[PDB]
PDB file of C-alpha atoms and ligand atoms in Angstrom:
ATOM      1  CA  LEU A1258     -13.940   8.919   2.527  1.00 22.13           C
ATOM      2  CA  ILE A1259     -11.792   7.995   5.503  1.00 21.84           C
ATOM      3  CA  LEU A1260     -12.002   5.979   8.750  1.00 22.62           C
ATOM      4  CA  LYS A1261     -12.487   7.560  12.236  1.00 21.43           C
ATOM      5  CA  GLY A1262     -12.647   4.661  14.712  1.00 19.37           C
ATOM      6  CA  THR A1263     -15.195   2.374  13.114  1.00 15.40           C
ATOM      7  CA  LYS A1264     -16.916   5.452  11.720  1.00 16.05           C
ATOM      8  CA  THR A1265     -16.828   6.726   8.146  1.00 17.13           C
ATOM      9  CA  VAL A1266     -16.246  10.466   7.804  1.00 12.26           C
ATOM     10  CA  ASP A1267     -15.375  13.009   5.145  1.00 12.09           C
ATOM     11  CA  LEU A1268     -11.999  14.614   4.665  1.00 14.61           C
ATOM     12  CA  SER A1269     -11.555  17.486   2.279  1.00 15.13           C
ATOM     13  CA  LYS A1270      -8.573  18.145   0.042  1.00 14.36           C
ATOM     14  CA  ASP A1271      -8.353  21.225   2.341  1.00 13.85           C
ATOM     15  CA  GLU A1272      -7.715  19.370   5.616  1.00 16.90           C
ATOM     16  CA  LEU A1273      -5.576  16.684   3.943  1.00 16.34           C
ATOM     17  CA  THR A1274      -3.146  19.353   2.668  1.00 17.73           C
ATOM     18  CA  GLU A1275      -2.756  20.857   6.152  1.00 17.79           C
ATOM     19  CA  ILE A1276      -2.167  17.477   7.869  1.00 19.01           C
ATOM     20  CA  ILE A1277       0.350  16.735   5.143  1.00 17.07           C
ATOM     21  CA  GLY A1278       2.315  20.004   5.504  1.00 18.14           C
ATOM     22  CA  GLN A1279       3.365  18.773   8.973  1.00 15.89           C
ATOM     23  CA  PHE A1280       5.373  15.843   7.490  1.00 12.12           C
ATOM     24  CA  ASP A1281       8.447  15.598   5.242  1.00 11.19           C
ATOM     25  CA  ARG A1282       7.120  12.628   3.160  1.00 14.15           C
ATOM     26  CA  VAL A1283       3.769  11.082   2.208  1.00 13.81           C
ATOM     27  CA  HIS A1284       3.367   7.305   1.736  1.00 12.68           C
ATOM     28  CA  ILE A1285       0.479   5.360   0.119  1.00 12.45           C
ATOM     29  CA  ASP A1286      -0.218   1.643   0.806  1.00 11.40           C
ATOM     30  CA  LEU A1287      -2.767   0.675  -1.747  1.00 11.34           C
ATOM     31  CA  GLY A1288      -4.703  -2.457  -0.701  1.00 12.15           C
ATOM     32  CA  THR A1289      -3.465  -1.929   2.855  1.00 12.38           C
ATOM     33  CA  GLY A1290      -5.529  -4.708   4.536  1.00 11.22           C
ATOM     34  CA  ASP A1291      -5.682  -4.435   8.355  1.00  7.07           C
ATOM     35  CA  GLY A1292      -3.585  -1.344   9.038  1.00  6.09           C
ATOM     36  CA  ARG A1293      -1.032  -3.313  10.998  1.00 11.30           C
ATOM     37  CA  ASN A1294       1.667  -2.955   8.377  1.00 11.21           C
ATOM     38  CA  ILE A1295       1.018   0.772   8.249  1.00 10.92           C
ATOM     39  CA  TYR A1296       0.782   1.141  12.009  1.00 11.42           C
ATOM     40  CA  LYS A1297       4.200  -0.469  12.417  1.00 11.60           C
ATOM     41  CA  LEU A1298       5.454   1.815   9.659  1.00 12.95           C
ATOM     42  CA  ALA A1299       3.938   4.948  11.195  1.00 13.95           C
ATOM     43  CA  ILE A1300       5.145   4.314  14.762  1.00 13.83           C
ATOM     44  CA  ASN A1301       8.843   4.237  13.647  1.00 14.24           C
ATOM     45  CA  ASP A1302       8.721   7.067  11.107  1.00 10.06           C
ATOM     46  CA  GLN A1303       7.053  10.059  12.726  1.00 13.81           C
ATOM     47  CA  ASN A1304       8.166  12.306   9.815  1.00 13.78           C
ATOM     48  CA  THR A1305       6.300  10.378   7.159  1.00 13.22           C
ATOM     49  CA  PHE A1306       2.597  10.791   6.707  1.00 17.39           C
ATOM     50  CA  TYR A1307       0.997   7.455   5.981  1.00 20.46           C
ATOM     51  CA  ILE A1308      -2.072   6.712   3.917  1.00 21.45           C
ATOM     52  CA  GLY A1309      -3.590   3.213   3.735  1.00 22.42           C
ATOM     53  CA  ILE A1310      -6.240   2.514   1.126  1.00 19.82           C
ATOM     54  CA  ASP A1311      -8.667  -0.404   1.207  1.00 18.94           C
ATOM     55  CA  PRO A1312     -12.295  -0.755   0.236  1.00 18.61           C
ATOM     56  CA  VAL A1313     -12.957  -3.242   3.071  1.00 14.63           C
ATOM     57  CA  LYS A1314     -13.419  -1.054   6.161  1.00 15.81           C
ATOM     58  CA  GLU A1315     -14.106  -3.892   8.636  1.00 11.49           C
ATOM     59  CA  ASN A1316     -10.516  -5.288   8.643  1.00 14.48           C
ATOM     60  CA  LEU A1317      -9.301  -1.837   9.733  1.00 11.38           C
ATOM     61  CA  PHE A1318     -11.619  -1.429  12.730  1.00  9.73           C
ATOM     62  CA  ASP A1319      -9.115  -2.589  15.341  1.00  9.05           C
ATOM     63  CA  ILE A1320      -6.187  -0.402  14.207  1.00  7.80           C
ATOM     64  CA  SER A1321      -8.346   2.526  13.160  1.00  7.77           C
ATOM     65  CA  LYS A1322      -9.634   2.309  16.732  1.00  6.69           C
ATOM     66  CA  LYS A1323      -6.093   2.175  18.070  1.00  4.78           C
ATOM     67  CA  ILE A1324      -4.587   5.076  16.096  1.00  6.61           C
ATOM     68  CA  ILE A1325      -7.437   7.319  17.259  1.00  4.78           C
ATOM     69  CA  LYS A1326      -6.478   6.844  20.977  1.00  4.39           C
ATOM     70  CA  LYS A1327      -4.153   9.221  22.845  1.00  3.42           C
ATOM     71  CA  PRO A1328      -0.406   8.951  22.027  1.00  6.08           C
ATOM     72  CA  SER A1329       0.174   7.747  25.623  1.00  2.36           C
ATOM     73  CA  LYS A1330      -2.103   4.773  24.946  1.00  6.54           C
ATOM     74  CA  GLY A1331      -1.338   3.832  21.302  1.00  5.44           C
ATOM     75  CA  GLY A1332      -2.610   6.773  19.292  1.00  3.97           C
ATOM     76  CA  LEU A1333      -0.897   7.990  16.160  1.00  3.21           C
ATOM     77  CA  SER A1334      -1.212  11.183  14.117  1.00  3.37           C
ATOM     78  CA  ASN A1335       0.653  10.220  10.933  1.00  2.00           C
ATOM     79  CA  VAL A1336      -1.972   7.652   9.801  1.00  2.00           C
ATOM     80  CA  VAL A1337      -5.175   8.061   7.738  1.00  2.90           C
ATOM     81  CA  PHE A1338      -7.264   5.178   6.307  1.00  2.00           C
ATOM     82  CA  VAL A1339      -9.013   5.830   3.029  1.00  3.72           C
ATOM     83  CA  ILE A1340     -11.886   3.612   1.984  1.00  5.71           C
ATOM     84  CA  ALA A1341     -11.599   3.480  -1.784  1.00  2.00           C
ATOM     85  CA  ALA A1342     -10.878   0.789  -4.370  1.00  2.00           C
ATOM     86  CA  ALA A1343      -8.035   0.843  -6.929  1.00  4.50           C
ATOM     87  CA  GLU A1344     -10.640   1.234  -9.688  1.00  2.52           C
ATOM     88  CA  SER A1345     -11.796   4.601  -8.278  1.00  3.31           C
ATOM     89  CA  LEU A1346      -9.167   6.452  -6.238  1.00  3.06           C
ATOM     90  CA  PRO A1347     -10.292   9.782  -4.657  1.00  3.53           C
ATOM     91  CA  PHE A1348      -9.241  12.935  -6.532  1.00  9.54           C
ATOM     92  CA  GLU A1349      -7.699  14.331  -3.304  1.00 13.52           C
ATOM     93  CA  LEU A1350      -4.869  11.879  -3.696  1.00 17.02           C
ATOM     94  CA  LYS A1351      -3.562  13.027  -7.087  1.00 16.23           C
ATOM     95  CA  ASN A1352       0.120  13.824  -7.282  1.00 17.90           C
ATOM     96  CA  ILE A1353       0.410  13.365  -3.501  1.00 17.08           C
ATOM     97  CA  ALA A1354       2.863  10.579  -2.642  1.00 15.50           C
ATOM     98  CA  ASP A1355       6.631  10.260  -2.486  1.00 13.39           C
ATOM     99  CA  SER A1356       6.313   6.473  -2.469  1.00 11.66           C
ATOM    100  CA  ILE A1357       3.461   4.014  -3.243  1.00 13.99           C
ATOM    101  CA  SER A1358       3.089   0.416  -2.145  1.00 14.75           C
ATOM    102  CA  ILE A1359       1.076  -2.660  -3.047  1.00 17.96           C
ATOM    103  CA  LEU A1360       1.885  -5.481  -0.667  1.00 19.28           C
ATOM    104  CA  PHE A1361       0.607  -9.049  -1.171  1.00 17.36           C
ATOM    105  CA  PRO A1362      -2.531  -8.075  -3.037  1.00 17.19           C
ATOM    106  CA  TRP A1363      -5.258 -10.523  -3.875  1.00 18.16           C
ATOM    107  CA  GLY A1364      -8.397 -10.788  -5.955  1.00 19.81           C
ATOM    108  CA  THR A1365      -8.541  -7.983  -8.522  1.00 20.21           C
ATOM    109  CA  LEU A1366      -5.667  -5.877  -7.163  1.00 21.33           C
ATOM    110  CA  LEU A1367      -3.412  -8.913  -7.675  1.00 18.86           C
ATOM    111  CA  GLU A1368      -4.506  -9.150 -11.272  1.00 18.74           C
ATOM    112  CA  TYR A1369      -4.130  -5.392 -11.873  1.00 17.48           C
ATOM    113  CA  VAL A1370      -0.502  -5.763 -10.814  1.00 16.97           C
ATOM    114  CA  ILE A1371       0.193  -9.088 -12.566  1.00 18.24           C
ATOM    115  CA  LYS A1372      -1.690  -8.668 -15.856  1.00 16.97           C
ATOM    116  CA  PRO A1373      -0.936  -5.729 -15.674  1.00 14.29           C
ATOM    117  CA  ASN A1374      -3.854  -3.381 -16.134  1.00 15.60           C
ATOM    118  CA  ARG A1375      -2.452  -0.238 -17.793  1.00 14.87           C
ATOM    119  CA  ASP A1376      -5.549   1.893 -17.047  1.00 16.34           C
ATOM    120  CA  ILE A1377      -6.053   1.095 -13.370  1.00 15.03           C
ATOM    121  CA  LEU A1378      -2.297   0.982 -12.704  1.00 14.94           C
ATOM    122  CA  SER A1379      -2.065   4.379 -14.353  1.00 17.72           C
ATOM    123  CA  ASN A1380      -4.417   5.813 -11.679  1.00 16.51           C
ATOM    124  CA  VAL A1381      -2.049   4.446  -9.020  1.00 15.39           C
ATOM    125  CA  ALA A1382       0.906   6.227 -10.677  1.00 14.63           C
ATOM    126  CA  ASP A1383      -1.339   9.328 -10.635  1.00 15.40           C
ATOM    127  CA  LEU A1384      -1.283   9.186  -6.846  1.00 15.91           C
ATOM    128  CA  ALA A1385       2.459   9.802  -7.086  1.00 17.17           C
ATOM    129  CA  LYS A1386       4.681  12.884  -7.329  1.00 18.23           C
ATOM    130  CA  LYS A1387       7.818  13.793  -9.338  1.00 17.26           C
ATOM    131  CA  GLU A1388      10.152  10.796  -9.005  1.00 19.00           C
ATOM    132  CA  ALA A1389       8.288   8.781  -6.367  1.00 18.97           C
ATOM    133  CA  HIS A1390       9.497   5.343  -5.340  1.00 21.61           C
ATOM    134  CA  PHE A1391       7.231   2.323  -5.891  1.00 22.58           C
ATOM    135  CA  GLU A1392       7.063  -1.292  -4.760  1.00 21.08           C
ATOM    136  CA  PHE A1393       4.954  -4.308  -5.705  1.00 21.72           C
ATOM    137  CA  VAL A1394       5.125  -7.475  -3.618  1.00 23.18           C
ATOM    138  CA  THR A1395       3.015 -10.252  -5.063  1.00 24.37           C
ATOM    139  CA  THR A1396       2.993 -13.974  -4.329  1.00 22.72           C
ATOM    140  CA  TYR A1397       1.017 -16.954  -5.614  1.00 22.96           C
ATOM    141  CA  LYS A1398      10.450 -13.905 -11.425  1.00 17.72           C
ATOM    142  CA  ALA A1399      11.290 -14.281 -15.115  1.00 19.62           C
ATOM    143  CA  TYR A1400       7.889 -12.923 -15.994  1.00 15.16           C
ATOM    144  CA  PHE A1401       8.622  -9.624 -14.223  1.00 17.26           C
ATOM    145  CA  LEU A1402      11.797  -8.838 -16.218  1.00 14.58           C
ATOM    146  CA  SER A1403      10.163  -9.674 -19.549  1.00 16.08           C
ATOM    147  CA  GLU A1404      10.045  -6.736 -21.914  1.00 16.60           C
ATOM    148  CA  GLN A1405       6.271  -6.953 -22.423  1.00 19.07           C
ATOM    149  CA  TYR A1406       5.697  -6.520 -18.673  1.00 19.34           C
ATOM    150  CA  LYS A1407       8.394  -3.863 -18.151  1.00 20.22           C
ATOM    151  CA  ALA A1408       6.910  -1.777 -20.995  1.00 20.04           C
ATOM    152  CA  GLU A1409       3.270  -2.386 -20.007  1.00 17.75           C
ATOM    153  CA  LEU A1410       4.336  -0.805 -16.681  1.00 22.14           C
ATOM    154  CA  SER A1411       6.208   2.207 -18.137  1.00 23.19           C
ATOM    155  CA  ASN A1412       3.050   2.837 -20.171  1.00 22.04           C
ATOM    156  CA  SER A1413       1.183   3.330 -16.909  1.00 23.60           C
ATOM    157  CA  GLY A1414       3.823   5.499 -15.249  1.00 25.86           C
ATOM    158  CA  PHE A1415       5.836   2.735 -13.603  1.00 28.14           C
ATOM    159  CA  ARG A1416       9.543   2.457 -14.377  1.00 26.89           C
ATOM    160  CA  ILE A1417      11.111  -0.806 -13.113  1.00 27.47           C
ATOM    161  CA  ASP A1418      14.612  -0.393 -11.547  1.00 30.43           C
ATOM    162  CA  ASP A1419      14.862  -3.640  -9.629  1.00 29.66           C
ATOM    163  CA  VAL A1420      13.124  -7.050  -9.578  1.00 29.22           C
ATOM    164  CA  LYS A1421      14.043  -9.398  -6.735  1.00 30.35           C
ATOM    165  CA  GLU A1422      12.656 -12.828  -5.951  1.00 33.57           C
ATOM    166  CA  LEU A1423      12.229 -13.127  -2.221  1.00 32.70           C
ATOM    167  CA  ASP A1424      11.499 -15.757   0.388  1.00 31.29           C
ATOM    168  CA  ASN A1425       9.795 -16.178   3.762  1.00 29.92           C
ATOM    169  CA  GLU A1426      12.419 -14.276   5.823  1.00 32.74           C
ATOM    170  CA  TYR A1427      11.710 -11.037   3.980  1.00 33.27           C
ATOM    171  CA  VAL A1428       8.034 -11.133   5.006  1.00 34.14           C
ATOM    172  CA  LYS A1429       8.919 -11.164   8.777  1.00 34.24           C
ATOM    173  CA  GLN A1430       9.356  -7.390   8.884  1.00 33.83           C
ATOM    174  CA  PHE A1431       5.571  -6.934   8.291  1.00 31.67           C
ATOM    175  CA  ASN A1432       2.803  -6.885  10.861  1.00 31.85           C
ATOM    176  CA  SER A1433      -0.473  -7.760   9.160  1.00 32.93           C
ATOM    177  CA  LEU A1434      -1.856 -11.133  10.179  1.00 34.22           C
ATOM    178  CA  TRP A1435      -1.853 -12.145   6.499  1.00 35.40           C
ATOM    179  CA  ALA A1436       1.850 -11.387   6.163  1.00 38.81           C
ATOM    180  CA  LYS A1437       2.520 -13.487   9.262  1.00 40.28           C
ATOM    181  CA  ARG A1438       0.530 -16.497   7.925  1.00 39.69           C
ATOM    182  CA  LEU A1439       2.778 -16.300   4.833  1.00 42.04           C
ATOM    183  CA  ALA A1440       6.067 -15.561   6.692  1.00 38.60           C
ATOM    184  CA  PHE A1441       5.606 -18.574   8.913  1.00 41.03           C
ATOM    185  CA  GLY A1442       3.618 -20.594   6.398  1.00 42.90           C
ATOM    186  CA  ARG A1443       5.126 -23.036   3.909  1.00 40.46           C
ATOM    187  CA  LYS A1444       8.199 -22.060   1.868  1.00 41.57           C
ATOM    188  CA  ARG A1445       7.151 -19.780  -0.951  1.00 36.83           C
ATOM    189  CA  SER A1446       8.386 -17.164  -3.382  1.00 35.51           C
ATOM    190  CA  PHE A1447       7.535 -13.505  -3.006  1.00 36.04           C
ATOM    191  CA  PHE A1448       8.201 -11.120  -5.896  1.00 32.97           C
ATOM    192  CA  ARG A1449       9.281  -7.502  -5.577  1.00 32.03           C
ATOM    193  CA  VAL A1450       9.126  -5.029  -8.398  1.00 29.86           C
ATOM    194  CA  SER A1451      10.533  -1.715  -7.315  1.00 28.34           C
ATOM    195  CA  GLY A1452      11.292   1.467  -9.229  1.00 27.77           C
ATOM    196  CA  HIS A1453      10.412   5.117  -9.837  1.00 29.12           C
ATOM    197  CA  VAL A1454       7.179   6.654 -11.231  1.00 28.53           C
TER     198      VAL A1454
HETATM  199  C1  SAM B1084      -3.960 -10.066   1.353  1.00 27.95           C
HETATM  200  S1  SAM B1084      -4.970  -8.660   1.861  1.00 27.95           S
HETATM  201  C2  SAM B1084      -3.778  -7.299   1.698  1.00 27.95           C
HETATM  202  C3  SAM B1084      -2.924  -7.333   2.934  1.00 27.95           C
HETATM  203  C4  SAM B1084      -2.014  -6.163   3.173  1.00 27.95           C
HETATM  204  N1  SAM B1084      -1.736  -5.469   1.899  1.00 27.95           N
HETATM  205  C5  SAM B1084      -0.806  -6.927   3.602  1.00 27.95           C
HETATM  206  O1  SAM B1084       0.178  -6.971   2.844  1.00 27.95           O
HETATM  207  O2  SAM B1084      -0.839  -7.550   4.671  1.00 27.95           O
HETATM  208  C6  SAM B1084      -5.678  -8.309   0.251  1.00 27.95           C
HETATM  209  C7  SAM B1084      -6.142  -6.873   0.359  1.00 27.95           C
HETATM  210  O3  SAM B1084      -6.201  -6.387  -0.952  1.00 27.95           O
HETATM  211  C8  SAM B1084      -7.387  -5.632  -1.045  1.00 27.95           C
HETATM  212  N2  SAM B1084      -7.833  -5.468  -2.416  1.00 27.95           N
HETATM  213  C9  SAM B1084      -8.138  -6.402  -3.359  1.00 27.95           C
HETATM  214  N3  SAM B1084      -8.503  -5.742  -4.509  1.00 27.95           N
HETATM  215  C10 SAM B1084      -8.416  -4.401  -4.285  1.00 27.95           C
HETATM  216  C11 SAM B1084      -8.645  -3.284  -5.077  1.00 27.95           C
HETATM  217  N4  SAM B1084      -9.039  -3.401  -6.345  1.00 27.95           N
HETATM  218  N5  SAM B1084      -8.460  -2.028  -4.553  1.00 27.95           N
HETATM  219  C12 SAM B1084      -8.040  -1.881  -3.247  1.00 27.95           C
HETATM  220  N6  SAM B1084      -7.805  -2.990  -2.453  1.00 27.95           N
HETATM  221  C13 SAM B1084      -7.986  -4.226  -2.975  1.00 27.95           C
HETATM  222  C14 SAM B1084      -8.419  -6.269  -0.160  1.00 27.95           C
HETATM  223  O4  SAM B1084      -9.210  -5.236   0.359  1.00 27.95           O
HETATM  224  C15 SAM B1084      -7.550  -6.803   0.953  1.00 27.95           C
HETATM  225  O5  SAM B1084      -7.630  -5.910   2.048  1.00 27.95           O
END
């Protein structure tokens, strides 16, 4: 289940695999929001295939509409938007990504990261290949380096290598409206848990 314009269509494992073969790397942005972060990402890295996942199709309408245009007028070919929720990822995404990403999640995806939820998180790891990079940027440090958290994450397939506390400046490289509200909002701490699956 993917987004063509503001339309919902069907993509097979078949067609996905072809599209993918034309790119050196595949990247998943779970909880992608409005596609702006991905769009920026895709425009600069034409050798990475990008997949954004979000169950809320309406926030993607504008960019989904934009990526579908001609390349002369804003179109892109390295971007697909999947409409699925973290608690039921499509089978066609197993063992597919070189790097997975969960940026600024909220509601339940925030909790699945923070708690963490071993079962759901494990499905996210399942979307990843051999030694695929990962990245988790939450925001509301010592909690993330705890042993209970680090080992709750291993258990799911997520091996922590680095854990930085970040600030507003870091968030300026992102394009979503949400990320801008936070970048130029009040001073705040953003947390980044990166590593290999
Ligand atoms: C703050 S917006 C994310 C913004 C985008 N990731 C960014 O960094 O700008 C929160 C997003 O998380 C998504 N979300 C919350 N729970 C989710 C879940 N369980 N599975 C997938 N997406 C989820 C919502 O759909 C929403 O689009």
